[PDB]
Each structure stands twice: as C-alpha cells, then as structure tokens.
Ligand SMILES: Nc1ncnc2c1ncn2[C@@H]1O[C@H](COP(=O)(O)O)[C@@H](O)[C@H]1O
Ligand SMILES: Nc1ncnc2c1ncn2[C@@H]1O[C@H](COP(=O)(O)O)[C@@H](O)[C@H]1O
Ligand SMILES: [Mg+2]
C-alpha cells in the first residue's frame with residue numbers, strides 16, 4: 153500500500169479527518185486532532201510572516217467579493233489575493249507602510265488524492281509590494297525563506313524541491329515562478345506542488361487601477377517619484393501543508409512502532425497525562441496536573457489500558473511528551489516525563505513539570 | 515451621532531475594517547487591527563471552551579455539506595452545527611468521549627447596522643451532549659459560564675443581559691432558550707443578540723439518525739442503557755462578538771482622550787515601541803527591542819511625529835503598553851513603559867522589559 157493510503161487510513165482512524173458527512177467524498181472534515189494540527193500550522197505561518205515581521209501586515213477579506221473584481225482577474229473566491237490587491241491603498245494608509253512591505257491573509261477558497269485536491273480548501277497567501285528594480289532580489293529571498301520555513305517545522309529537506317517554471321509555462325503577467333514541491337508519494341510522479349512563489353510584476357495593481365479607476369500606484373517621497381510596485385506572491389496550501397507535514401512526520405521504527413515525528417509546535421496534543429493505573433489515589437493528582445497543563449497547552453488524559461498501549465497511541469498521533477504518575481509519585485511528588493521519539497524517560501518534580509515542558513514545547 | 519456610527523468611523527479610520535471592495539456594502543473586510551482582534555477573540559473562545567476543558571473537543575467541518583443534511587435541518591451552510599451533529603459518533607469513537615461532553619467549532623456561515631447583520635459571517639458554536647435528566651442543570655451552567663466569559667474579557671457587566679425566550683417564541687424542538695444580549699446602541703431598541711444558549715433536547719440526533727439511518731444514540735456501560743443525548747448549544751457571533759468588545763472598550767476621557775479599553779488578551783497591538791525622536795542613536799536600539807518583542811507579540815514601531823500624538827494613536831487603537839526609548843536609555847539601558855488606561859509611566863531595565871510585559875499581557 154502506498155504511503156499516502158496508509159497515512160490517510162491512520163488519519164481517519166485517530167480522528168485527524170472524517171469524510172465530510174460520512175452519512176463529493178473529496179470533501180473532508182477535520183477531527184479534533186486535525187483541527188488542532190491545522191490551527192498550529194496556520195499560527196506558525198502567521199507568526200513567521202506577520203507578527204515577526206515589521207514590513208508585513210495582515211488582512212481578512214470576504215469570500216464573496218464584487219463581480220467586477222473577478223472580471224478583472226445579482227450573481228456572485230477562487231483565490232484570496234484580489235482582496236489584498238483591492239485593499240493595497242487602504243493598508244498603505246492605515247498601517248503607514250511603504251514598499252518593500254507585505255500584506256498577508258489566510259482564508260477559504262473554492263478531485264481525489266485524499267485532501268491534495270479538494271473543492272473547498274484554505275490558502276495562506278502574502279503579497280509583497282516592492283519597488284520594481286528590487287523584485288528579483290526580493291523574489292529569491294522569499295523563495296529561500298518560504299522553503300526553509302518548512303524545514304524549520306520538521307520537514308526533511310530531501311523531500312522538498314524547487315521547480316522553476318520555464319518561459320512557456322509562465323503566465324503573461326509572471327516574469328519568474330518557482331514552486332516548492334513535496335514528495336507526497338503519488339502514483340507515477342510522486343512530487344506535488346505545495347507553495348507557489350511568483351513574480352507578478354506590476355500586473356495586478358495596474359489591472360485593478362484600470363478596472364476600478366483608482367490609482368493604486370505608490371509615491372515615494374524620498375525620491376519624489378511615483379510607480380506601480382511589483383508584487384512577490386508566496387501562496388501556500390493549508391490543506392496541502394497539513395498533508396505534507398503529516399506525511400513527512402510518519403515513521404515506522406527489532407520492533408516496529410508507528411510514530412508521527414511532529415515538530416512540537418505542530419503536534420495536536422502537546423502532552424498526555426497517564427496514571428499508571430486507574431487507581432483511586434493516582435487519578436486525582438493526575439487530573440490536577442492535567443488541569444494545570446490545560447492552562448497552557450492542549451492535553452489528553454488517558455487512564456485506559458496498559459501504560460504501554462497508551463504510550464503507543466500517544467506516539468501514533470505524535471504527542472511530544474507523556475507524563476506518567478505512578479505510586480512513587482504519591483511519595484516523592486515527581487512524575488516521569490517520556491519524550492516521544494527517543495522514548496527517554498526522566499523523573500522530574502511536579503511543581504517544575506510545566507517549565508520543563510515549556511522550554512521543550514517551543 | 516450614535517455611539518455605533520462613531521465606533522464604525524473610528525474602525526474605518528484606523529484600519530480595523532474596510533468596506534469590502536471599496537472600489538453589498540454590508541460586506542466588510544478586516545484590516546490589520548481588525549484581523550488581529552478577531553483572531554484574539556477566536557483564540558480566547560477556543561481556549562476557554564476546548565483546550566481548557568477535558569470534556570470538550572474541537573472539529574472543523576466543510577462549509578458545503580451534503581444536501582440531505584440541510585433537508586433534515588448537483589446543487590449544494592447557514593450554521594456550523596449540522597457538521598457537529600453528523601460527526602457525533604466519529605468523535606465519540608476517536609476522542610473516546612462520553613456524555614456529558616462537548617464538540618466545539620468555529621467557521622464561516624452564509625443587511626446593515628454596520629457588521630451586526632452581514633451576509634457572510636463567522637460563528638463559534640459548541641454542542642454539549644448530556645444524559646437527558648441533567649440537561650436543565652447543564653443548561654444553567656453554560657448560560658452562566660458563557661455570560662461570565664464576556665465579562666472576563668473586559669465587557670462591563672451592565673451592558674449585558676439575559677433574555678428568556680417565552681414559550682411562544684420557543685421552537686418546537688427547543689425546551690428553553692436564553693439569549694445573551696449586549697447594549698450595542700441601536701436606534702429604538704439599543705439591545706441586540708450576541709450569543710444564544712439553547713436546550714435542543716434530543717431533536718438533532720434523532721432527526722439525523724432518522725434521515726441517515728445511522729443510530730447516533732449513546733450507550734452507557736456504567737448503567738447498561740441506551741439513550742439519545744440532549745444537546746446544549748452555545749452559539750456565539752464572532753462578528754457580533756468583535757462588534758460588542760469594540761463598542762464596550764470605547765471611551766472618551768479637563769481634557770478629552772479617545773481610548774479603547776481592550777482587555778490585553780484582545781488588543782490587536784500588544785506593545786508599541788516609540789523612540790523619543792527619529793535620532794540616529796535611538797532608532798537602532800528601538801528596532802532591536804521591537805524585534806525581540808515581535809518574537810512573542812504583535813508590535814508596532816512608530817518614530818513619526820511628537821511622542822504625544824503617537825501615544826494618542828496607540829491609545830486610540832487600545833494598545834496596552836508603550837515602550838519609550840529616550841536618550842537616558844542610551845546611558846542607563848532602561849526604557850519607559852506607559853500603561854494605556856492610567857497613562858502611568860515606569861522606567862524598567864530593557865533586559866527585563868519582556869517579562870515585565872508578559873505578566874501584564876496575560
Ligand atoms: N484544490 C486544492 N486543494 C488543496 N490545496 C490547494 C488546491 N488548489 C491549490 N491549493 C494550494 O493553494 C496554493 C496556491 O494556489 P494557486 O494560487 O492556485 O497556486 C497551492 O500552492 C496549493 O498548495
Ligand atoms: N447576519 C449575521 N451577522 C453577524 N452575526 C450573526 C448573524 N446572524 C447570526 N449571527 C451570530 O451568530 C449567533 C448564532 O446564530 P443562530 O444560530 O442563528 O442563533 C448569533 O447569536 C449571532 O451572534
Ligand atoms: Mg507585524
């Protein structure tokens with residue numbers, strides 16, 4: 153069985169995903185784990201792009217926009233970029249930004265290969281407006297940065313690549329386009345697109361200024377000049393990003409153990425509290441610690457079955473850490489922290505546990 | 515001018531909101547500040563409902579669901595609840611949950627009063643399934659809890675109220691319904707709905723089990739019994755929640771100062787770094803500190819104009835704290851922290867600033 157089918161079956165079994173209305177079929181709902189993973193991915197993207205950057209701001213435009221907007225690109229989005237292009241001047245005005253600077257957005261746009269190609273999906277797109285003569289430079293920068301982003305979130309570099317669009321497959325408005333591709337594992341060609349980084353020149357603002365009559369050019373006072381900025385567009389797939397991170401984290405460990413090697417910042421469940429048994433003495437302290445940890449992270453409490461099977465489930469979903477409360481805990485007031493990948497166990501005082509986990513959960 | 519019009523004008527001026535495609539009109543895009551505020555509200559709701567609760571899990575269902583789903587409630591959502599009702603059993607299975615327990619979701623569903631009534635909006639809904647004989651109890655609980663939630667995020671209690679639906683205005687499937695209403699400030703009746711907490715009995719699961727043929731009843735082993743759980747539905751408006759928080763935070767301060775008294779956890783911009791002047795010596799250290807803070811929170815750097823006007827803008831948008839870097843900072847290596855509401859200023863060492871802010875930013 154292909155890796156893709158295996159990962160999809162695992163996702164369905166552990167509630168990462170459910171067939172949308174099990175009772176299109178390419179429409180998928182995200183179960184608890186799936187929702188948490190998707191949100192973690194979105195938050196990391198937003199933090200790397202918006203909150204961490206002085207030159208990039210955020211925006212959230214309506215799915216249903218005026219019909220003339222898409223005539224330019226009582227009847228009434230296939231992408232999230234046109235809202236950004238239309239609110240360019242509004243952002244320049246309120247946020248007090250000048251090129252080079254970015255406007256970032258995430259949102260839903262409207263088959264097979266599991267969730268690779270779905271009718272309803274979510275995109276994470278940024279429009280970086282720059283003075284034309286720097287576009288190329290900036291383009292490379294982003295091409296690099298975006299790529300490393302995935303690596304920085306745990307994707308094996310060897311499963312990522314850059315595909316340069318040849319002049320024939322380049323759009324008339326696109327001067328250069330470099331797509332990040334991931335080795336999903338499809339039949340035939342196993343590589344697929346994940347995020348497209350395009351140099352759209354000044355086509356978008358020019359077109360919207362012509363069709364709207366509003367001058368969307370920027371005026372640089374430093375030089376007393378006026379120009380239509382060039383646009384660098386990193387457009388990443390949220391559904392495809394989740395698919396890629398999930399696929400890459402999958403691993404089978406002589407003994408065999410299934411484990412999702414999620415980067416901590418992306419795991420749906422950060423910590424699992426596991427009383428050695430259902431004993432009346434262990435469970436209360438365990439639930440107390442679990443409540444303390446829920447004050448910070450999404451936690452799971454499981455007192456069911458042997459400790460080994462519970463460890464197996466928590467690794468199967470990629471939980472970074474497990475906290476075991478044994479009978480010695482009732483005496484020394486310490487718990488056993490088990491790190492997912494290495495399975496290394498270390499006994500630490502309960503009143504420090506949180507900090508011990510914080511540093512490690514990034 | 516009504517408070518509502520004033521707040522809307524302020525929102526448009528400072529980039530909380532833009533008229534969707536300025537170039538329906540009741541469709542609104544969220545500018546940078548607006549996006550950050552909306553996301554903060556969503557995150558607090560999710561933390562209070564999902565991550566902090568052992569008995570509540572999350573889910574994210576597709577906007578476009580099978581047509582029979584809405585026949586029960588190639589042509590193809592007005593609410594986000596039907597996905598939850600359809601995935602009840604899937605969640606019981608993957609998450610290993612038993613009544614009483616909740617399934618929470620947030621998502622877009624599809625005029626005037628600014629953003630109070632918009633065609634495309636976002637809801638935050640939770641379905642709490644419980645053994646029937648406890649519904650009433652639980653209902654009250656949630657009715658209380660939800661209410662306090664708003665108060666805990668800074669809304670003056672006196673602008674919130676509970677409206678009991680009389681038997682005539684109760685739906686056939688609803689046994690009791692208590693709507694939280696906020697004093698928005700409309701013409702005529704200034705109160706409007708904000709979140710509805712309904713007791714839907716076992717209508718939803720019964721209807722979906724009849725129309726789908728799949729038995730969605732729960733089996734309690736502790737008693738060896740089988741029953742259709744009763745549903746408690748807190749359904750809050752994300753657009754209306756933002757409108758309410760924004761309206762309530764607005765204040766005019768003898769001298770007059772406009773200020774948004776946002777709870778820290780909801781302010782779009784948590785901190786503003788303000789060099790006393792554009793001097794070449796102050797700006798570098800200021801940008802260094804600003805980068806350090808962007809590692810944690812959304813920050814704004816403003817070296818434009820007099821320090822007073824910059825303080826005025828940062829209060830006008832509700833920024834909790836301002837960090838001023840003066841020439842003495844170059845000597846003592848300390849900065850002046852100005853707390854929004856009180857305007858109290860305290861000089862603190864730079865290498866501690868972050869912690870000083872952390873404790874206060876909750
Ligand atoms: N049908 C789809 N399902 C899931 N993700 C998609 C789909 N179409 C596009 N994407 C993602 O959205 C990104 C930007 O789309 P585009 O602007 O059309 O290149 C792509 O690089 C994909 O990661
Ligand atoms: N047209 C709308 N615009 C903005 N928010 C809405 C709209 N309709 C409903 N809501 C919010 O969604 C919540 C749940 O909707 P409902 O399930 O229809 O009662 C309401 O309590 C409102 O806060
Ligand atoms: Mg920023």
Ligand SMILES: [Mg+2]
Nearest residue numbers: 564565567570
């Ligand atoms: Mg939870």
